[PDB]
């Protein structure tokens, strides 16, 4: 019943695959992806990932459109876009890649949701503002900081715990 977090793959297939692994060998009902997955050929390394995913648009992702289109083909339930608002466990999420600042600063200090989750900055972090849960998972390619995360999030009892890869 607990769900899996990335961002920022930036094509590196070989963390992807380890990351895809993990969310399997782990309950993970589904999957969320905030970052830039940026290449297409990416999208087909999913279909082999057992949960389902609610992915964001990043900045550097150029194919908005095939994106969609490859990811509903993995599975119609998947769903990608600029930003996500949904619930999960009577919990309220909201999603979003880095990206535009205002609107993710605004999210969090609104107080509408319980989890605010986003990418983009490459840098991880974990805290709570308010008795909202703010996460970004970190960097799955590791490229800018030389350390690969991904995060698995307890909607159960909210306890979340990062992988490095």
Request: with cysteine; glycine share 10%; hydrophobic share 40%.
């Given at each position: 019943m607990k769900i899996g977090i990335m961002s920022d793959t930036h094509d590196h297939l070989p963390n992807?695959?380890?990351?895809?692994?993990?969310?399997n060998d782990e309950n993970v009902e589904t999957v969320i992806?905030?970052?830039?997955?940026?290449?297409?050929?990416?999208?087909?390394?999913?279909?082999?990932?057992?949960?389902?995913?609610?992915?964001?648009?990043?900045?550097?992702?150029?194919?908005?459109?095939?994106?969609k289109e490859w990811l509903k083909d993995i599975n119609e339930e998947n769903i990608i876009d600029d930003f996500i608002s949904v619930?999960?466990?009577?919990?309220?999420?909201?999603?979003?890649?880095?990206?535009?600042?205002?609107?993710?600063?605004?999210?969090?200090k609104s107080g509408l949701y319980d989890v605010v989750i986003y990418g983009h900055t490459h840098e991880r972090v974990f805290e709570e503002v308010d008795d909202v849960l703010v996460?970004?998972?970190?960097?799955?390619?590791?490229?800018?900081?030389?350390?690969?995360?991904?995060?698995?999030l307890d909607t159960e009892k909210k306890e979340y715990r990062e992988i490095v890869l």
């Open positions: 992807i695959r380890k990351a895809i692994e993990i969310f992806h905030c970052g830039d997955f940026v290449s297409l050929f990416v999208i087909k390394e999913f279909e082999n990932l057992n949960a389902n995913i609610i992915a964001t648009y990043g900045n550097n992702d150029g194919e908005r459109c095939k994106l619930e999960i466990d009577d919990l309220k999420f909201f999603i979003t890649h880095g990206h535009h600042q205002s609107v993710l600063e605004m999210a969090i996460i970004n998972p970190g960097e799955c390619c590791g490229y800018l900081t030389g350390i690969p995360t991904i995060g698995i």
